[PDB]
Amino acid sequence: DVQLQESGPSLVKPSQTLSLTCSVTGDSITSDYWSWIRKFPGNRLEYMGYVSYSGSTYYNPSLKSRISITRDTSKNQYYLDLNSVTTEDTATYYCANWDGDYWGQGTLVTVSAA
């Protein structure tokens, strides 16, 4: 069966690039589209974007072109890069397949000067 799992730093500094990894188990990433979603403090959900089979990507304009979603078939995982983060990027990041049947456990990433 398929399982998703986010990993990466939980604490990052302002202005740096926030990067996360979603590890897919149970099937190949070449058999689906892959997305990233984040939840802000306040029950506000935001769909960040996804990468489809052709490698084409769709990113939410709200991210102001600071995001990058890539994949690595040999490792069966995909990634999220968010450049020049601010405290506004603090949230719980989740990876999920495109249709939403599979979600990771989510990981809280806090952006702080300290």
Added chain:
Amino acid sequence: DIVLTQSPATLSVTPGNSVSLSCRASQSIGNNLHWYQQKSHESPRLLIKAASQSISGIPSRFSGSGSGTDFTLSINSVETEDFGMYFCQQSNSWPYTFGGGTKLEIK
């Protein structure tokens, strides 16, 4: 972007009662509306896809209806385990967007 409004944002109900949650879109989205359940400390769980299509493994008491700009998630005989947040998400147009969520609380 397409704006999804979930009002009432909070719903108080007694277990055993039947309720309906609303999700309206700023522009028609056909049947491209998905319903999620998110209990505290957990990842969202897809309950209904394409507005009314059932999902294997989900309790039968959950059902969805509607089309265009007005959708509804219906719960037949609310159970205690059902208390939590419910979000609707549209996939008709990019960017995909989520409603502000409706919290189901006990009376």
Added chain:
Amino acid sequence: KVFGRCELAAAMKRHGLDNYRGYSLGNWVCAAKFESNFNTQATNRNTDGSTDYGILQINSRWWCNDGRTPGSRNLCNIPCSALLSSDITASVNCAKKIVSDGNGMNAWVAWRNRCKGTDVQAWIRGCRL
């Protein structure tokens, strides 16, 4: 089953294809017309060993699994045999995932050759919708 032009336009509208990811309803009706001639049973084997199935000719090498095609990816995670019903539900769900790739409706060769660039709206005109 063979749909009538207007019959399918109404069905596709109901199945949420009107203005799905920037593609107006006429695009889908026109696509069905030239891909399968509105026939839900349409089945055509290809040179690369794959086969296209259904009203929207979904391919067995990329979208559905027919178990006899080389390098199958089954992106729609569904058996091709399940896309041959009179009920267009399954083909629409898969069509939506297909068009959600950056290639859009270009995945449908016939649509690309006979619909793209034409007055697709004409395909839903003169219909009760």
